[PDB]
Amino acid sequence: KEFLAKAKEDFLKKWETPSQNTAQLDQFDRIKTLGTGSFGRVMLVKHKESGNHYAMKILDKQKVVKLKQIEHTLNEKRILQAVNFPFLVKLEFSFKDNSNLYMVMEYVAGGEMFSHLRRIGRFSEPHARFYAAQIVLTFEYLHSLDLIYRDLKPENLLIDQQGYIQVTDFGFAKRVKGRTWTLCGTPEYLAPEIILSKGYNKAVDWWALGVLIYEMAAGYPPFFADQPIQIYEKIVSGKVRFPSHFSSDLKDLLRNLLQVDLTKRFGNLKNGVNDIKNHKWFATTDWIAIYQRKVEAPFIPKFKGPGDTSNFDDYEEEEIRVSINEKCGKEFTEF
Ligand SMILES: O=C(N[C@@H]1CNCCC[C@H]1OC(=O)c1ccc(O)cc1)c1ccc(O)cc1
């Protein structure tokens, strides 16, 4: 398309020359912890000079050097300043201190899809389709840019003010023309080729689309157990049991998305994304009106004024420590 060609040129310019050091800590007021992760936490901040709320992600340089995840961390930031899609959380600023790595993202007050799916129980198939349509389109954009996302799950999906999805957590995202090999992602969502330690491609993302749709519509993942090892055993056999309330259409899309044989899975066939887009479970979806956000969202989060954290959890509020000494400069010089 003309747009996918435009998406390539804008991605590439930014990917070739990253925005670096576009803000600093003392321009932001610290308010509350919105989430924590492997290398830090995401905190609601308020821009002092504009008054805008942002979600500032803080990763401690020392812990990512120590857990060896420096290339993935650099990958996350470089992909984020270089992408631009309506269903992606926008990275507004980036900088580093002595101890940390900061990414301030737009505040998406509706919180994680996870909360809402657990609170509502299961989403109706229109509601699930509404969300899945956004991901299919997001994944078409990211795969065109030769980016594999690699961590689709409802915790990494935020619901905005309009009830539209905003994808976050690009910590495992990667620029891959072809196959890649890292044991990345989340157990319930890992495609059989990741589990079987193969050189996998963009189709792991499409398998994880099948885990999300089944989970959004059943209210629970297709492959669950207590041990990771037992979840894995279920995924490589890949025999899915569907809920009776699932339509025939839904069961058919999910059998083709949750196809263990990678060369037979939707999104990875010769017709590509069109086998999903043209599936009868998406027969009533106007793909451009989803993109243009002209479809009435089936759920709009109860939003107040900006800075309401109602839709996120309470975490222990720790001190944001920035050392006198500059730790891990060399490792993180491209950041
Ligand atoms: O990325 C966001 N939150 C994610 C929601 N996904 C599940 C919890 C992880 C959390 O991000 C982290 O807290 C986090 C993740 C990894 C890491 O290394 C450090 C922090 C996020 C982004 C923008 C927002 O407006 C609001 C939240």
What are the b/e assignments for 260-278, b being 16+ CB within 10 Å? Answer: bebeebbbbbeeebebbbe
Closest ligand 1 atom, residue 107 Cα: 25
Q: Determine the distance separating the centroid of ligand 1 and the alpha carbon of 269, expressed in angstroms.
A: 33
Q: Which two tokens mark 191?
A: 């495609």
What are the CA-CA distances from residue 75 to residues 46, 104, 148 (Å)? 26, 16, 11
Known binding residue 107? Answer is yes
What are the CA-CA distances from residue 32 to residues 36, 55, 151, 169, 309 (Å)? 11, 10, 25, 19, 8
Known binding residue 64? Answer is no
Q: Cα 105–182–83 angle (5° rounding)?
A: 30
Known binding residue 111? Answer is yes
Preceding-residue numbers of gaps in the chain (C–N over 2.5 Å): none
What are the CA-CA distances from residue 253 to residues 19, 123, 167, 207, 237 (Å)? 40, 17, 22, 11, 18
Q: Determine the distance separating the centroid of ligand 1 and the alpha carbon of 40, expressed in angstroms.
A: 9
Structure determination technique employed = X-ray
Residue found by looking up tokens 């059943």 in the block = 218
Q: Which CATH number fits domain 18-111+303-333: 1.10.1070.20, 3.30.420.40, 3.40.50.720, 3.30.200.20?
A: 3.30.200.20
Catalytic residue among 60, 97, 151, 314: 151
DSSP 43-56: EEEEETTT--EEEE
How many residues in the chain?
335
Domain limits, the chain: 1-17+112-302, 18-111+303-333
| Four-CA torsion 27, 31, 32, 36, nearest 10 degrees | 10
Closest ligand 1 atom, residue 111 Cα: 26
Strands (E), the chain: 28-37, 40-47, 53-60, 91-96, 100-106, 147-148, 157-159, 165-167, 174-175
**HSE-CB of 278 using CA atoms within 13 angstroms:** 7
Contacts of 272 (CB under 8 A, 6+ apart): none
Cα radius of gyration (the chain): 20
For ligand 1, atom 17, name the residue with the nearest CA. 37
What are the CA-CA distances from residue 133 to residues 59, 99, 170, 225, 257 (Å)? 32, 40, 19, 28, 14
What are the b/e assignments for 184-203, b being 16+ CB within 10 Å? Answer: bbbbbbbbbbbbeeeebbbb
Instruction: Find, among 191, 159, 181, the residue nearest to 266 by Cα.
Output: 191
Q: How many CB atoms lie within 10 A of CB 284?
A: 8
**Amino acid present at 275:** D
Q: Is the dihedral of CA 306, 293, 275, 124 positive or negative?
A: positive
Q: Could you give the CA distance from residue 172 to residue 75 in angstroms, rounded to a whole number? A: 8
What are the CA-CA distances from residue 127 to residues 46, 213, 285 (Å)? 32, 10, 11
Q: Could you give the CA distance from residue 320 to residue 259 in angstroms, rounded to a whole number? A: 45
3-class DSSP state of 88 = strand
Cβ contact 42:57 at 8 Å: yes
For ligand 1, atom 3, name the residue with the nearest CA. 35
| Ligand 1 pocket: which of 168, 309, 314 to mutate (most atoms within 8 A of CB) | 168
Instruction: Find, among 214, 156, 147, the residue nearest to 186 by Cα.
Output: 156
Residue found by looking up tokens 């004024």 in the block = 305
Q: Determine the distance separating the centroid of ligand 1 and the alpha carbon of 35, expressed in angstroms.
A: 5
Q: Is the dihedral of CA 295, 299, 304, 306 positive or negative?
A: negative
Ligand 1, CB cutoff 6 Å, lining residues: 34-42, 55, 57, 59, 89, 105-108, 112, 155-156, 158, 168-169, 171
| Ligand 1 pocket: which of 77, 169, 317 to mutate (most atoms within 8 A of CB) | 169
Known binding residue 198? Answer is no
Q: Determine the distance separating the centroid of ligand 1 and the alpha carbon of 111, expressed in angstroms.
A: 10
Q: Could you give the CA distance from residue 288 to residue 135 in angstroms, rounded to a whole number? A: 13
Q: Cα 160–165–171 angle (5° rounding)?
A: 105
Cβ contact 156:168 at 8 Å: yes
Known binding residue 57? Answer is yes
Q: What is the CATH number of domain 1-17+112-302?
A: 1.10.510.10
**Amino acid present at 169:** D
Closest ligand 1 atom, residue 169 Cα: 1
Q: Which two tokens mark 256?
A: 């083709």
Q: Determine the distance separating the centroid of ligand 1 and the alpha carbon of 80, expressed in angstroms.
A: 14
In the residue annotation, 151 being an active-site residue is answered as yes
Known binding residue 106? Answer is yes
Instruction: Find, among 276, 271, 110, 125, the residue nearest to 209 by Cα.
Output: 276
| Four-CA torsion 4, 203, 212, 234, nearest 10 degrees | 180
Q: Could you give the CA distance from residue 262 to residue 260 in angstroms, rounded to a whole number? A: 6
Q: Determine the distance separating the centroid of ligand 1 and the alpha carbon of 155, expressed in angstroms.
A: 8
What was the resolution (in A) of this experimentally determined structure?
A: 2.2
